[PDB]
Design a protein around this ligand. Structure first.
Ligand SMILES: [O-]
Length: 42
């Protein structure tokens, strides 16, 4: 276990989360955005 940076469910609204050497990145599902994939555009 080295670095999944996805510990502690960080993204919101079923936002997926990849990995990186400095903070992961959030991927909002179609219809969400915001710093956390928080916001439902609709
Ligand atoms: O990653």
């Amino acid at each position: 276990k080295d670095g999944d940076q996805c510990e502690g469910h960080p993204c919101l609204n079923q936002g997926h989360c990849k990995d990186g050497i400095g903070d992961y990145t959030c991927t909002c599902a179609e219809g969400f955005e915001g710093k956390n994939c928080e916001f439902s555009t609709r």
